[PDB]
Amino acid sequence: MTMMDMNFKYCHKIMKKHSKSFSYAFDLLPEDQRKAVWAIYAVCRKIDDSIDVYGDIQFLNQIKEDIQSIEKYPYEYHHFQSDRRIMMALQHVAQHKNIAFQSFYNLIDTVYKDQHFTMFETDAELFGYCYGVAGTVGEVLTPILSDHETHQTYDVARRLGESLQLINILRDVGEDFENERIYFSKQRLKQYEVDIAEVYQNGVNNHYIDLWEYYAAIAEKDFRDVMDQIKVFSIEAQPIIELAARIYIEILDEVRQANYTLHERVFVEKRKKAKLFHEINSKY
């Protein structure tokens, strides 16, 4: 193992610890593409968890400076201020692939803002948030999962990312509430007459279910539109991205089967992930 393999192995460990679904699917990419995905992912993860290190933007400002050093001088040695293992790996990827740095900056700006969180007044603000924390991630992965990126490739990756975030929001309603976060928009909560604290306390009901299903239908429609444009991606990545998306979509059925419970995190068993892989690998 060289020092660089060690950096990537660490990025892998962070990815697999935070998301078994994404690890499951993306670890199936050819070696050079999955290593790049591990590093990009670990960077995004570090950004998402930065504020809780001291309870300051300290660590986040450092990650940002680190990324900026890479963008400005990709072939210079840098003494990284945040997580060296991860930044050495991202710099390594950046020397071989085109990275959309502005997308990492958008993600960083979204996390900064999240320190002064206030509920979304409208669905447009919620979707803006989905772009920021996850559409951005699809953007940064785009050059890795495609032969020749076009605006379409980014469009699709972005849409997929936003759909997956909406699916996460839908799986995590109860846990997010405990952390004082509600992502459904005030517009929509009022329309459907839903009060999340009331539901967390008294259980689901038809209003809540209807509102939850209104968002799930948005996620599902966006998923199919992405599936119909799966070809923008390289041949080896197509089936992997399909598995990633299916494994994540399945979370919706899991939530339903648990009666939209707001008191536990549902999941797609590892055995079901292998079943979906069987299905997908059958058409590829």
From Swiss-Prot:
Which residues does the annotation say bind (2E,6E)-farnesyl diphosphate 2?
Answer: 45, 165
Gene Ontology biological process terms in this record: carotenoid biosynthetic process
Pfam assignment, any one:
SQS_PSY
Where along the chain is Mg(2+) 2 bound? Answer: 168, 172
Domain of life, per UniProt, equals Bacteria
Q: Which GO terms describe its molecular function?
A: geranylgeranyl diphosphate synthase activity; metal ion binding; squalene synthase [NAD(P)H] activity
Q: Where does Mg(2+) 1 bind?
A: 48, 52
Which chemical reaction does it catalyze? 2 (2E,6E)-farnesyl diphosphate = 15-cis-4,4'-diapophytoene + 2 diphosphate
What remark does the entry make about the cofactor? Binds 2 Mg(2+) ions per subunit. A third Mg(2+) ion binds between the 2 farnesyl diphosphate (FPP).
Q: What is its EC number?
A: 2.5.1.96
Provide this UniProt record's keywords sorted from A to Z: Carotenoid biosynthesis, Magnesium, Metal-binding, Transferase, Virulence
Q: In which pathway does it act?
A: Carotenoid biosynthesis; staphyloxanthin biosynthesis; staphyloxanthin from farnesyl diphosphate: step 1/5
Q: What S-S linkages are listed for this chain? A: none
Q: Needs which cofactor?
A: Mg(2+)
PROSITE patterns with a match to the protein in the record: SQUALEN_PHYTOEN_SYN_1
**Binding of (2E,6E)-farnesyl diphosphate 1: at which residues?**
18-21, 41, 45, 171, 248
Q: What class of enzyme is it?
A: transferase
Q: What InterPro entries does the database record attribute to this sequence?
A: Isoprenoid_synthase_dom_sf (IPR008949), Squ/phyt_synthse (IPR002060), Squalene/phytoene_synthase_CS (IPR019845), Trans_IPPS_bact-type (IPR044843), Trans_IPPS_HH (IPR033904)
Q: Which family does it belong to?
A: Belongs to the phytoene/squalene synthase family. CrtM subfamily.
Please describe what this protein does.
Involved in the biosynthesis of the yellow-orange carotenoid staphyloxanthin, which plays a role in the virulence via its protective function against oxidative stress. Catalyzes the head-to-head condensation of two molecules of farnesyl diphosphate (FPP) into the colorless C(30) carotenoid 4,4'-diapophytoene (dehydrosqualene).
Give the protein's recorded name. 4,4'-diapophytoene synthase
